[PDB]
Design a protein around this ligand. Structure first.
Ligand SMILES: [K+]
Ligand SMILES: [Mg+2]
Ligand SMILES: [Mg+2]
Ligand SMILES: [Mg+2]
Ligand SMILES: [Mg+2]
Ligand SMILES: [Mg+2]
Ligand SMILES: [Mg+2]
Ligand SMILES: [Mg+2]
Ligand SMILES: [Mg+2]
Ligand SMILES: [Mg+2]
Ligand SMILES: [Mg+2]
Ligand SMILES: [Mg+2]
Ligand SMILES: [Mg+2]
Ligand SMILES: [Mg+2]
Ligand SMILES: [Mg+2]
Ligand SMILES: [Mg+2]
Ligand SMILES: [Mg+2]
Ligand SMILES: [Mg+2]
Ligand code: NA
Ligand SMILES: [Zn+2]
Lengths: 80, 118, 50, 53, 153
RNA sequence: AACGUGUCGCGAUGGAUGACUUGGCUUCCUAUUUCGUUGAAGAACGCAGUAAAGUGCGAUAAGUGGUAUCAAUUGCAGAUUC
RNA sequence: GAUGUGGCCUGGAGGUUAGGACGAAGCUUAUGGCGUGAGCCUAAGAUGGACCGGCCUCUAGUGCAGAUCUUGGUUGGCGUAGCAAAGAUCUAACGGAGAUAUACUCAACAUGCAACGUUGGAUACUGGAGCGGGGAAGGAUUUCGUGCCAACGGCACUCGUA
RNA sequence: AAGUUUGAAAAGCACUUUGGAAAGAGAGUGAAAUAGAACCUGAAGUCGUGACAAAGACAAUGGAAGUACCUCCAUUUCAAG
């Protein structure tokens, strides 16, 4: 029977954690990520989901070097 | 300073510590005003003040703390009691008091010298 | 009071099921005081657990 | 220009005992299955939205 | 602050309990029956209900409950014996008696004068139904307030 | 009789309205204004005397150095130009 | 279906004229008065605690009973339907606030019920394709000891994978 | 989903008494506790309680015209009127 009983027949897992992006979207059998396309050099980006683009773009994380370089540029690379 | 109420209130309530110091100033007495030609000074620990508005007006004391996160000063003679019986100090906004005796240091003297109106 | 811990430790020490461990119903105060395998072994030696 | 329309909402159709307004997709939240896009829905788009022209 | 005030405050005792985890409908019937009673009579009645020699008459929330002979003394044919509500009301009566003693009044003269039961805020659980449905399973607790006065012989 | 009905006084449940606004939306302007193999954006794990999240930071880790200020920080502890 | 109205009402702007801690907005009503009406105004609050009314112009996201309308909250049915597969518990002592809990009168019954953990004893069940003992997948502290009993374990708890 | 909007200030209820506890009854702070911690205001709907009016089965509601009883409402009159 295709409903409740068959729910108990689902055993393995299709996806595991991705090294590059951290989502549970790394397809184990085809060794590639459904979310970020790792290990292809560039990442997944599609204009039919601007919402997904805005979830992933620059500034959603830390910007730990960009803040520094922005300040240096604003101060004209001042040095003693 | 700002033709925008939203921006002015945001700046006031998010001011840093060294800006809160200046925002928490109190007028000097008439004698001190005449001696120094300065109208007001930021309040400092160990100065002497007299309360001018509120329930405790007329009381005198010495400043024990400028809390600066609650926007108040604490005076040693201004206090009350809890239900337990132990006493607690009561906070007063610094614009409601008058300074009667400054705590003098070399740098405070320099500050008064640069604020002199002569 | 509960002597569950002493019964479990005595089962482990004597190597039998719980149905074969006998705890004396008049020495509950003494059995309450044993918290280690060493103390329970002393109880077995003294005969409050057989 | 985007306000009130940032959902992938679809009508459930007839044959269920609910009004035919479009509804939010998904599950696991209190907004799932709620009414959407209409000027009479909470969180929907206003009637004749205003413009700068 | 109670919904009524005693005539003479100095000769009265009060008691109250909030968000009590007993069924509102059972406690309504259990508490309303002692309203005009002397305190010792009310306590005797509660003891006899626990012993099942007398019953509590159910007058409002009684749709399709059983019929009994012990309801005849109240002019009814329906009544029950709710022990969970009875023990809580016994506790409340003991508290009111202690308050009267501390004020310096004689408990063998007190007469209950005000009783009021109200629905409190509900708590939520859930139950599972056929074809994958989930449906509410709620609890209905109550507030109780009362006061008693000294009768003047 | 009881149950029920109606009106007024007082209580409960419920969270509307008013007043409030460090938020949003929209328009306009000024610049020695535009990241990365000299390893970016993103992702992970850590760091406080007390510290889950958040914020800041990287084994020099709720910060080192310099300049300017001038007496705090603060829930509790701890300790003038330092 | 057309049209008129020194016709009524709501948010904001330009003017003008007023009110308010001796109490603004909001809210309540067997509070009357005015108007054919939409509505307006006064009274009382044993309500509230800081803003706001009239008039002339300007402007609009400007008036609800119903759309199997949207979102939040209530409600009769209702102490109702039910909580019936896997056979089943009994007894004493100890533990616990969970008792042997009383106004006159009254020896005790007829006025404190119901229910619980541990140990001993009795009686049954699983019946080696096991409510036995170990592993993979999946889960990730659920494991151990001491406490605790608000919520959760669709009855209960002094007990618990809480 | 969700304003943390108690109060000027925690002054966030010492102490006594009943209870296993949660709490209750007193006492106290505050201008105010019907401001007691998710705490300004606190509507509608629904419910409890006290007092009162009655009332057959005529479903209830509704129109018109009177009367019995009530009325924290308004207005007008009291002596030459
Ligand atoms: K039944
Ligand atoms: Mg398969
Ligand atoms: Mg596969
Ligand atoms: Mg919107
Ligand atoms: Mg039946
Ligand atoms: Mg079911
Ligand atoms: Mg299912
Ligand atoms: Mg509002
Ligand atoms: Mg570029
Ligand atoms: Mg942390
Ligand atoms: Mg290093
Ligand atoms: Mg509209
Ligand atoms: Mg409406
Ligand atoms: Mg059954
Ligand atoms: Mg069975
Ligand atoms: Mg057998
Ligand atoms: Mg249960
Ligand atoms: Mg309130
Ligand atoms: Na508008
Ligand atoms: Zn990836």
């Amino acid at each position: 029977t295709k409903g409740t009983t068959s729910m108990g027949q689902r055993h393995g897992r299709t996806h595991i954690l991705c090294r590059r992006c951290g989502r549970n979207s790394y397809h184990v059998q085809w060794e590639r990520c459904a979310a970020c396309a790792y290990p292809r050099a560039s990442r997944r980006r599609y204009n039919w989901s601007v919402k997904a683009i805005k979830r992933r773009r620059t500034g959603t994380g830390r910007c730990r070097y960009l803040k520094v370089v922005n300040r240096r540029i604003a101060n004209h690379f001042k040095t003693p | 300073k700002c033709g925008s109420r939203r921006k002015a209130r945001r700046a006031h309530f998010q001011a840093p510590s060294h800006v809160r110091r200046v925002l928490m100033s109190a007028p000097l007495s008439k004698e001190l005003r005449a001696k120094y030609n300065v109208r007001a000074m930021p309040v400092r620990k160990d100065d002497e003040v007299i309360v001018k508005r509120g329930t405790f007006k007329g009381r005198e004391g010495k400043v024990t703390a400028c809390y600066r996160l609650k926007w108040v000063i604490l005076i040693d003679k201004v206090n009350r009691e809890k239900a337990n019986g132990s006493t607690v100090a009561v906070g007063i906004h610094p614009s409601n008091v008058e300074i009667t005796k400054l705590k003098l240091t070399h740098h405070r003297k320099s500050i008064l010298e640069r604020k002199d109106r002569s | 009071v509960s002597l569950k811990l002493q019964a479990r430790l005595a089962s482990s020490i004597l190597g039998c099921g719980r149905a074969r461990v006998w705890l004396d119903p008049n020495e509950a105060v003494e059995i309450q005081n044993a918290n280690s395998r060493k103390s329970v072994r002393k109880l077995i030696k003294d005969g409050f657990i057989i | 220009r985007l306000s009130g329309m940032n959902h992938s909402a679809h009508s459930w159709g007839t044959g269920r005992a609910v009004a035919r307004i479009p509804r939010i997709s998904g599950g696991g939240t209190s907004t799932s299955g709620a009414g959407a896009f209409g000027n009479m829905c909470r969180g929907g788009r206003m009637f004749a939205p205003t413009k700068i022209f | 602050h109670y919904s009524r005030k005693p005539q003479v405050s100095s000769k009265s005792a009060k008691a109250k309990v909030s968000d009590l985890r007993c069924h509102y409908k059972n406690t309504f019937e259990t508490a309303n029956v002692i309203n005009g009673m002397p305190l010792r009579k009310a306590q005797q009645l509660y003891r006899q209900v626990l012993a099942k020699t007398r019953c509590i008459p159910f007058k409002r929330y009684n749709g399709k409950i059983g019929r009994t002979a012990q309801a005849k003394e109240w002019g009814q044919t329906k009544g029950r014996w709710p022990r969970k509500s009875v023990v809580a009301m016994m506790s409340l009566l003991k508290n009111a008696e202690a308050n009267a003693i501390e004020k310096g009044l004689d408990p063998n003269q007190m007469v209950i004068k005000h009783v009021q039961v109200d629905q409190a805020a509900r708590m939520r659980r859930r139950t599972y139904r056929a074809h994958g449905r989930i449906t509410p399973y709620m609890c209905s607790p109550c507030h109780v307030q009362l006061f008693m006065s000294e009768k003047k012989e």
